[PDB]
Amino acid sequence: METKDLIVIGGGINGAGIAADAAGRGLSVLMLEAQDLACATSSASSKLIHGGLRYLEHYEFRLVSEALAEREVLLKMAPHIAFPMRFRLPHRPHLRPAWMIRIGLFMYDHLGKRTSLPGSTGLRFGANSVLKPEIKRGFEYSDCWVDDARLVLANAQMVVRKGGEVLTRTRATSARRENGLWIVEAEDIDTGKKYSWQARGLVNATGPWVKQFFDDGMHLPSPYGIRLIKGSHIVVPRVHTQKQAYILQNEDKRIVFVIPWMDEFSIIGTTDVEYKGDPKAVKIEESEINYLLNVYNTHFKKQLSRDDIVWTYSGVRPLCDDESDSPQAITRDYTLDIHDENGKAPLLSVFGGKLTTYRKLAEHALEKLTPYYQGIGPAWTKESVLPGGAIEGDRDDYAARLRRRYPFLTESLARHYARTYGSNSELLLGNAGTVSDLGEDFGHEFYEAELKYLVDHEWVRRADDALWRRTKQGMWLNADQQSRVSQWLVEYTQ
Ligand SMILES: Cc1cc2nc3c(=O)[nH]c(=O)nc-3n(C[C@H](O)[C@H](O)[C@H](O)COP(=O)(O)OP(=O)(O)OC[C@H]3O[C@@H](n4cnc5c(N)ncnc54)[C@H](O)[C@@H]3O)c2cc1C
Ligand SMILES: CCCCCCCCO[C@@H]1O[C@H](CO)[C@@H](O)[C@H](O)[C@H]1O
Ligand SMILES: CCCCCCCCO[C@@H]1O[C@H](CO)[C@@H](O)[C@H](O)[C@H]1O
Ligand SMILES: CCCCCCCCO[C@@H]1O[C@H](CO)[C@@H](O)[C@H](O)[C@H]1O
Ligand SMILES: CCCCCCCCO[C@@H]1O[C@H](CO)[C@@H](O)[C@H](O)[C@H]1O
Ligand SMILES: O=S(=O)(O)CCCNC(CO)(CO)CO
């Protein structure tokens, strides 16, 4: 035995959150990820811990209130990678009347309950603003920003910390009930190595693949349909120097964000495009670009063209199919389904579930699995502090504290370590006492010490894991520098 309490198939945010909650109640957990942690939807998001202002218009009170209250649980769990942000909503009275704005903002304020985030205000825009002169009024409120892919990584580390196991580049190929137990077969996507495990419980947390895993992996009927709704983002040099996010009301009733990113960039997104096909094939199309540039360019004085775009990304929302005609109207609430056979081998399956609500989702899931597990521990994550999160202060205090402790660190590198690794920064730096102890410089202060640390402690296997998921150094490294990172990973993981 040899036999796991629980196998979690999926290593995006909901599968990592489930596995981590389960490990911390004393279940023996294995989490399986076909490629890299957060390689799909969980690295393609707008990167916001948000209440979901636009969902109020659709009466989504359970979601908005749960999500609103979770902002502050998450900012305490992961202050290394999550922080407060202010959003500016410009007034477009022809679309929504001030009196209506002014009411939703009240609900946003008191629907979840907020120990700490500031409340909403009105705004005037003058001749000197970043917005076109004919926009003269707006509103400002709070929500949060989170490094989505690194929130997934922090949960995976939590799994291992609590004695669970995490395998990546390992695709589950089937799961079947036999003699009271699950048999889970999986294969290593590079070497072909086959694996078979037994488990007492199974989680299908494969996001856009949830129904396909029922169809091809289990030959079981899926309790729910999935709607795959593509959304894309574009990235430009920062459109202004302000620290605030803008939330823009487009003529179709959608909202589009303009978010400060890494002090140097702005992210513009997103879109709601019905999608069919392979979720791994998803990429931005011409009309998404035209659509995003349109709502930006009709609101701001400094005009962007297509040639300004430095990077794009795209992903598919796996939304529980509530059958709505309009992709923007489909609920963003999640549904969990649990099913046993003869009171044994439960199947927990996950439909939908935004990054904002993963922790609650995960706790709901364990609740449903509880009858099947012995002297299973109680709930515990609201009070936990994720790996990296133990920083005693904010990100910026911590970076100043790192540079005091390790004075060979430039202020930019200290900032990067504090904002990425948080309290794991001391494990990365090890016995380093100079710049030169960090090893090969791969560019933009991405040193061998970081990269080795990423392989040893963050499941990095290929350049993109390191450069696009654990970090966003891919934004600065040239093609030759990125290929040297791959060459190094081959040599080191040989
Ligand atoms: C455009 C966009 C913007 C968004 N913005 C926000 C936002 O601002 N705030 C917010 O809270 N949410 C946001 N979301 C929603 C959020 O990103 C998703 O709800 C969330 O990431 C879903 O994660 P998941 O774990 O359920 O799916 P994923 O974990 O991402 O997908 C399944 C994962 O499991 C693995 N897997 C799949 N099948 C198998 C298998 N057969 N065997 C082994 N492994 C497998 C994969 O490889 C895959 O990565 C956004 C979503 C989109 C699309
Ligand atoms: C227009 C004279 C009052 C000055 C306030 C600035 C304009 C923003 O005022 C807005 O005007 C709209 C009508 O055009 C209404 O639909 C909105 O609810 C109102 O708040
Ligand atoms: C305190 C916030 C809650 C207010 C309840 C809704 C009434 C808001 O009313 C709005 O205020 C604006 C400012 O003078 C006007 O331009 C708009 O005509 C009016 O609709
Ligand atoms: C479909 C949207 C209409 C909702 C029905 C409510 C009637 C809206 O009426 C509005 O009420 C406001 C106070 O709440 C006033 O400030 C506005 O000037 C008034 O037009
Ligand atoms: C009495 C029941 C009425 C519930 C309807 C809630 C109306 C929420 O309206 C919301 O206002 C926000 C501004 O704060 C906008 O950003 C959103 O687009 C809009 O949906
Ligand atoms: O440092 S943690 O314990 O939180 C995670 C360690 C993970 N190590 C691996 C080493 O090959 C992946 O980085 C796999 O066990």
From Swiss-Prot:
Glycosyltransferase in keyword set: no
Misc. remarks from the entry: There are two sn-glycerol-3-phosphate dehydrogenase isozymes in E.coli: one is aerobic, the other anaerobic.
Catalytic activity: a quinone + sn-glycerol 3-phosphate = dihydroxyacetone phosphate + a quinol
Function recorded in the entry: Conversion of glycerol 3-phosphate to dihydroxyacetone. Uses molecular oxygen or nitrate as electron acceptor.
Cofactor(s) for this UniProt protein: FAD
Name of the protein described by the UniProt record: Aerobic glycerol-3-phosphate dehydrogenase
Enzyme class: oxidoreductase
